[PDB]
Design a binder for this molecule. Structure first.
Ligand SMILES: [Ca+2]
Lengths: 49, 40, 49
């Protein structure tokens, strides 16, 4: 059963998603962002000492 | 309160059809129908 | 045979699929416990038992 949602990028925020299949009882998910990391791409130019 | 000739009496004095005795279904509230003694 | 009075019909879920995708619940008032012959009087819906 395909589904889609949008959740905030805030650390520790207890996001809850609701899935409502027409033939089954509703379900609730809990997703939490414990930790993020932004990785840039680097090119070395020179070294100074 | 004796049940009919085609009815079975649970130990709670309730009457259920004989065809429901030992059918693997707990028809009686006290499972008298599925009791081991009655089913043998 | 048990005497059935005040019989109402409600549907929990419906999904017109190839398999038996419909759950039906009946509320009634009776005097004894027995067996009834359940039938549907249209070919739009086919019962299972
Ligand atoms: Ca039984």
């Amino acid at each position: 059963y395909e589904h889609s949602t949008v959740m905030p990028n805030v650390v520790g925020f207890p996001y809850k998603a609701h899935i409502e299949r027409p033939g089954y009882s509703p379900l609730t998910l809990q997703m939490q962002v414990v930790e993020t990391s932004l990785e840039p791409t680097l090119n070395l130019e020179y070294i100074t000492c | 309160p004796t049940c009919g000739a085609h009815e079975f009496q649970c130990s709670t004095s309730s009457c259920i059809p004989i065809s429901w005795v030992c059918d693997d279904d707990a028809d009686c509230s006290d499972q008298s129908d599925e009791s081991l003694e009655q089913c043998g | 045979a048990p005497t059935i009075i005040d019989l109402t019909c409600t549907v929990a879920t419906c999904t017109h699929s190839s398999d038996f995708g419909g759950v039906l619940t009946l509320t009634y008032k009776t005097d004894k416990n027995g067996d009834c012959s359940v039938h549907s009087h249209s070919n739009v819906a086919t019962l299972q038992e």
